[PDB]
Amino acid sequence: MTKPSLISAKILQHINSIVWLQSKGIQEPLKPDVIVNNVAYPPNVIAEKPVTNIEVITNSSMIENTGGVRQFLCKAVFEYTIVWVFSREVYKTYHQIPRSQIQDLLVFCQQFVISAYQGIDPDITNIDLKPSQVLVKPTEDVNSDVSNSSSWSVVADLRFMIEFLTSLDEFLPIDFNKIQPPTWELLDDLDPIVPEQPFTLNGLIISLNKSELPKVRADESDTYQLEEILYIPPTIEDQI
Amino acid sequence: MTKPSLISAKILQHINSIVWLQSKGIQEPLKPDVIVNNVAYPPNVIAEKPVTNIEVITNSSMIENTGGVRQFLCKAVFEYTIVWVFSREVYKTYHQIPRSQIQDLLVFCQQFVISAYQGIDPDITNIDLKPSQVLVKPTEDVNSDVSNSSSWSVVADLRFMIEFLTSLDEFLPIDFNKIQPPTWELLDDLDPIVPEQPFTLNGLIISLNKSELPKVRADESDTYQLEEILYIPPTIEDQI
Amino acid sequence: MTKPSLISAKILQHINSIVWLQSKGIQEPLKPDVIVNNVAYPPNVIAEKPVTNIEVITNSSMIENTGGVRQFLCKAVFEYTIVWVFSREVYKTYHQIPRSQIQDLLVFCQQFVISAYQGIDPDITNIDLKPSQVLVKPTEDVNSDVSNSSSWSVVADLRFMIEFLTSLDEFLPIDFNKIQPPTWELLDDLDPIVPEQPFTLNGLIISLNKSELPKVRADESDTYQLEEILYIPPTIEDQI
Amino acid sequence: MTKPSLISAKILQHINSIVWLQSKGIQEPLKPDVIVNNVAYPPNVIAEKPVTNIEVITNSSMIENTGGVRQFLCKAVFEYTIVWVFSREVYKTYHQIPRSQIQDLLVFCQQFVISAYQGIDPDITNIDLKPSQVLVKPTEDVNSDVSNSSSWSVVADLRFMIEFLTSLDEFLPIDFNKIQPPTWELLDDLDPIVPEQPFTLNGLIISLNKSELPKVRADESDTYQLEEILYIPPTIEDQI
Amino acid sequence: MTKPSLISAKILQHINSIVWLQSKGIQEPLKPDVIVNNVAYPPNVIAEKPVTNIEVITNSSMIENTGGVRQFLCKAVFEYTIVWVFSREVYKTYHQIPRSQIQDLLVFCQQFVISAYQGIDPDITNIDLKPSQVLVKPTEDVNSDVSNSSSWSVVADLRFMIEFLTSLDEFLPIDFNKIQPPTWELLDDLDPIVPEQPFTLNGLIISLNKSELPKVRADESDTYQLEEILYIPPTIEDQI
Amino acid sequence: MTKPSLISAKILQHINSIVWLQSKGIQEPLKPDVIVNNVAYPPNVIAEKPVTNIEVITNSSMIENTGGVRQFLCKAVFEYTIVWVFSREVYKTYHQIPRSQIQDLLVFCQQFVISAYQGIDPDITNIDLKPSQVLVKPTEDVNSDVSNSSSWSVVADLRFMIEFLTSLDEFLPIDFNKIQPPTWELLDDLDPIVPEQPFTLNGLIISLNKSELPKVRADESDTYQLEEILYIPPTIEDQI
C-alpha cells in the first residue's frame, strides 16, 4: 500500500536487531564515544534519503484486475545512509578500525530486510538490492587528536529497489493533512474531475420483448411486442 | 489530437484531486505559509516544462489508413516540476519534514494520470512513466530563521512519455493565431505547395468499348468499337 | 538525386504552409514585433545547419543494379533550427508565452515533411525523425523592459534522417560552378583517372570456327577451321 | 559464512607464499631498502580496501532451502592494493626496474587465491578476477637522489569478485562487540521485531473425527463424532 | 598490399575529378581568392591525417592459406580533412555561402572512392564509410573585412574504414629506406630471429623397407629389410 | 609460462627484423639524426609499458586437467610505444615526413608478432590486436630550427591482448630474487599455508575382507572376516 507506512516498517526492520542508530539526521556526529555498560562505542547517524525513481508501470503480471478499481504496481528506490565516526584518539592507524564488523553489520541488515517480505508490507511483490558502497572518507570537519587530524568516517549506503502493489482507494486526505487541505480551489477557475464512485445495485428493471415468429431482430419497433416490465425487488415499484 | 488541448487536460488531471497548486511559474515562493481553515501549509509552485522529444514515427501498428488523409503517431515527453518550500522556522531538522506525504502525493498523481486514458484525450494510444526524481535541495535564496539558513525545498518531477494519434486535418490557422498570420508570403518569392484537397464525386462518365471476337486487347484503336458514353447522373449532361 | 535540389525542396516544404519564416540567418532578431493586419507577431529566424553524417553505404536492398552506372544509397541528417523571440514587454510571465502553439506548429511541420515523400524528391527511400528539442533559453543579448531583463527565446530544432538514391551521372561541373573550376590540374603533376564512358554498339564482328568431329576444343589451332567472318551491319565492311 | 573470517583467510592466502608484506597501511614507505641475508630489497606496503558492492540477490541455483532458516548468496568485491617503492639511488632508469618480476608475483597471487576454494572458506561458491591494473606512478613525496627526483612506485591492485553462502544464524552479537552493544533501545520508542525462533517438538496432540457414512465433510459439526484425543508421548497428559 | 602505394592511390582518387586541392598542409589558407578563367574561387587545403586503428585480425573468411607464406587481413581508418575558406568580403551572410555545393562535392568524393575497388588496390576486400562531419567553424585567425571579422571556414572530413589483404613477402627494406637502415644491430646484443625461407626441392631421397609377412610394423629394426635407396633425379648421386 | 621470459621473447620479436630501436626509455630523444652508411636517420625510442589487465579466468576450454597441479589461463595486455623524432631542420612541412613508411613498419611488426605463435612461447593460446593509434603530436620540448619550433614526433602504440597457459609449478623463488627473499616471516605472526606436495607411491597395503554368503555389506564388523593383508612390494614389510 502507501509508502509512509511501508517506509516506517523499513526503518523499523533496519534498527530492529542489526544497526544501533543513536541519532537520525544529515550530519557527522561530534559527540564523544558513547559509554554503555562501561564500554565505549563510536558515534553514528542515519540519513534517510528521499524516495526516488517512483515509477508506475501498469505492465506486470502480478497486477490483478479485480474489477472494482484499477490496481497499479509501483517501483521505488529507498536509500538509507549509515555513517559511523571513529575517533583518531583511540584508532591511530586506518587498518585497526573495525571495517570487517561494519561490513558484517551491513550484510546482516541486507539479509534481514530482504527476508522480511511479509513483515514490511503484505503488498510487496519484489525487493532487490543495488550494490552497496562502503567508504572510508574522512569526517566533514571533525578532528580528534593533536595536529587536528580528521577522524575516520565509515559510510555505508543501502539502496533497496522495491516493487509493490497500490490502488487509488488507498489514498485519502488524512495522509496529506499537513501538506494539502482537502477540497481546495482550482488554480485557473476550472472544475475538478470527480473519479468514478463505486456503484451499488439497489434495484433492477427488466423490459423484455416478445419477438415475431421467424427470428428476433431487435431494431424495428413493429417486430416485437412488449410483454411485461419486471422489477426484481417488488419494493422498487413506486420508488424510482 | 492537438497538443494544447491535450496539455490543458494533462494539467487539469494533475490539479484535479491530487496536487494543490497555489501558483504556476518558474520561481521558488517567498510567500509565508498559507493559512486555510486556521491551518498553515507550505508554499508551492508548478513549472510546466516545454514539450520535448516531439517525434513522428509513422511506424506503429496503431495507425489506420482510413484513406482520407494520412494519419500519424506522435510521441512526446511532457515534463512537470512541482516544488514545495518548507520554512526552517517550523521545520528545524531535515528528518521532521513530511517527505513521505510528498512521495505519496507524487505516486497518487502518477496513478491518476496513468489511469485517465479516456479522460485526457480519446486519441491517446500509450502513456508511460519515466523514473521520477525527488530532491531535497535548498531554496534558491529563501532564508527563514536567524543566521539566514536556507529553507528546505522539495522538488519532484513528473515526465510522462505519451504516444497519441494525429492527422493533418486537425491543425487549422485558429490555433496559430498569436504566433503566425494565416496566408503569409514566401521568404524567397517562392510559391506555396498546396496540399491535396478532399475530392467530391459529383458526376461519373463511363466510356465502354465493344471488343473484337477473339479477346479484348485495349491498345490498338481498330480492335474495339465505341458503343455508348454513359453519364451516371442524367443531370451531368450539358453540365461538364 | 543531388542534395541542393533536395534541400531547396526541404526548406520549401518547411515554409510551405506551416512555419512563417521572416528571415534566414544565425542571429536572434532585435526587430520589434511585426505588425500585419493590425496584429503583432513575435520576430523569428531560421538557421539551416550544414549537412552532417553524409555516409554512402552501398549495402541496402533498395539499390538496383541497372547495369549502366553503379548506384548508391546516401544517408544524411538535415538539421534546421527555428527561433522565436517573445518580448517581455507583452509577455510578463513565462507561463503566458504560447509554447503550446509553438509545439503544435513544430509537430505540424514534422508531419508535413514526413508525408511529402513524392514532393521533396522522387528518389527518397526513407525519411525518419530524430527527437526534437524545444528550449526556452533567454535571447543572446536582447532585452525588452526596464531592468534590462532578457527576452524569452523559444528554440526548436528539426533533424531529419533521410536516405535517398544517387548515381555518379547526376553530378556535373555546373553544380560546382562557384567552388571548383572544371578540368583543373593535379596537385603533384599526376594524371587524372578518367571514369568509364558509356559504350555504344556501332558494329559487331563474329568469327566462328568449324570444329572437328569428336567435340569442340577451342584451344589448339589445328582442331578447328575458320568458316566465315560476319559483320552484323554490312556497312561495317571497309569502315573498321 | 561471515566476511571477517573470510577476509582474514584471504589476506593469509595473499601473504602465504607469494607477496612479502613488510607493513600494512595506506602510505608509501620512506624506510630505506630492507637488508636481509646481506641483500637489499625495496620497501612495500599493502592497503586492504573496504569491502564494496555488498549485494544479496537470493536468486541463484546454489541456494538450498534446508527448511530451518532462509539462506542467502552474497556477492562482494574484495580489493587489495600492493605498492613497492624502488629508490632512484639504485634504479637510475625506468626500464631497469624489475616490473617483470612484479607482474610474475601478481599473477602467482591471482592463481593461488583462485585455486584455494576449499582453503579460504568452505561456503565459497564462486571466485572471479577483475582485470588488474599495474601503475608505475611516482611515489607520493618520496625523493631518493640529488635534484630531489621522485622514487619509482609500482602499484598493483587485486579485486576479487567473490560469491559465497550466508545465513541469518551465522551472525551473533559477539562479532559486533566493539561497534554495537547487544540489546539496545529503539530510536523512536518502538518495539524490536523478534525473528522466528527454532521450534522444538516436545508433544503432539491428535484429535480425530469419525465421519458419517456417505463421505467426510469436515465443516458441519453434526456430521462427525469425536472418537478419541491422542497424546503421542503419554507424558504430555497432565502437562499441557 | 602495402599502405603507401594504397594511400597514394587513395589521394589520387580523391583529387581525380572531384575535389580541386590547391595545397596540401595543416593550415587554413591566407592566400586571396584564386583567379582562373577570370572567375574567383575560395582557397582550400587538404590535411592527410596519419593512419590510425591499424589492426591485424587473421580472423576473416577472405584469407586464403596458399601454403607459401601466411596471409593477413588488415583494417585501417584513413582520414582526410578538406577545408575551404570563404572570405567575408564577398560572402556577407552565412546563408549565402555555397554549403550545398560543398556537400555535393563531398558526397561525390565518397561515391567515387567507394566505387573504385579495382582502381585503388587489387587486394582491397572492403571499403566502408564513417559518418562525415561538416563544420562551418570560423578560420584560425583569418580576417577579411573591416572590424576584423573572422572568415567562414567549411571543414569536411572523410574517414574510410578499409580492409585489405597483406603478406609478409610484400615488405622489403626499400620501403623503409629513410627511416630504418637494413641489417641493423640488436639493442641488447641479442641475435635476430631469421624468418623461414622458401624451400626449393632440388633432390629427393627415398629409402623403402620390405616388411615381414604378417604386416608392416615400422618400429623394430629386425621386422623389415632395406631393399633400395632411390634418388629421384639420378644427378643427386655423388652430390649430397 | 612465466611472463618475463614471454616479454623478453616479445621485445625480441619486435626488434627482430622490423623496428630498429636505438634506445629504450621514457623520453623523446634530443640526440642528432643518427649517421650510418653516410645516411641520416631520425632518433627513436621505445617505451615498454607495465603489463596491465592481468586476469586469471580458469574458464576456458583450452585448460587441460592433467591431474598433477591445477592449470590456469591468463590474459594480459602488453603495451609497447615507439616514438620517432623528425627534426624540422630537414622536414620543413608536415606532409613531407614519412608517415606512410612508419605505418608500413607498424603493420609489419603487427603481422610478425601475430604470426610468431610458436616463436614467442609454446604455451600461447591466443594473440589478438587492439586498434593501434598513430599520433603526430609535437616533441616534449625538442626544438630544431630558428624560432624554436617544436620537432615532429610520430608516436605509435602496439597493444597485444594475449592469452596463455600457466601453472603453479612454473613459479620459483629464483624469479623473485631481487624483489622478495625466499622463506620470509608472516606479518601478523601467522603460519604459512603450505600448498600440496606431489605424492609419490612407494608402497601399497591392501586389506581385503571375505564377506558372508548373502551379499557384501561392509558396515557391520561381524559380517566379514579378514583374510590377508597384502603388501604389493614385499620390501614394505618391516619398513612402515
Author numbering:
A (entry chain b), B (entry chain a), C (entry chain f), D (entry chain c), E (entry chain e), F (entry chain d): 1 to 240
Sentences from the paper on this structure:
A-1(L) is a Myoviridae cyanophage isolated in 1970s9 that specifically infects the model cyanobacterium Anabaena sp. PCC 7120. Using cryo-electron microscopy (cryo-EM), we solved the structure of A-1(L) tail machine, which consists of three parts: a 205-Å-long neck, a 1045-Å-long contractile tail with a complicated baseplate, and six pairs of tail fibers. The dodecameric gp2 portal, the pentadecameric gp5 and the hexameric gp7 sequentially constitute the neck of A-1(L), to which five neck fibers are attached. The long and contractile tail of A-1(L) contains 24 rings of gp10 hexamers that form the tube, surrounded by the sheath of 24 helically stacked gp9 hexamers.
Moreover, docking of tail to the neck is accomplished via direct interactions: Loopβ4-β5 (residues Gly55-Thr65) of one gp7 subunit and antiparallel β4′-β5′ hairpin of neighboring subunit interact with Loopα1-β1 (residues Ile15-Val34) and Loopβ5-β6 (residues Leu135-Trp152) of one terminator/gp8 subunit, respectively. In detail, the ring formed by Loopα4-α5 (residues Ile83-Tyr99) of 15 gp5 subunits is hooked by six long α1 helices (residues Met1-Leu25) at the N-terminus of gp7, whereas Loopα1-α2 (residues Leu20-Glu30) of three gp5 subunits tightly interact with the Loopβ5-β6 (residues Thr70-Lys75) of trimeric gp82N. In contrast to the initiation with two separate proteins, the termination of the tube and sheath is fulfilled by a same terminator. Each terminator subunit simultaneously interacts with two tube subunits via Loopβ3-β4 (residues Thr58-Gln71) and β5 (residues Thr125-Leu135), and one sheath subunit via a protruding β7-β8 hairpin (residues Asn202-Ile240), which disrupts the inter-ring interfaces of the tube and sheath, and eventually terminates the extension of tail. Notably, the A-1(L) terminator is structurally different from the previously reported ones in the tailed phages and eCISs. The tube and sheath start from the tube initiator/hexameric gp18 and sheath initiator/hexameric gp30, respectively, but both stop at the same terminator/hexameric gp8. In addition, structural analysis suggested that all pairwise interfaces are complementary in shape and electrostatic potential, enabling the interlocked assembly of the symmetry-mismatched A-1(L) neck.
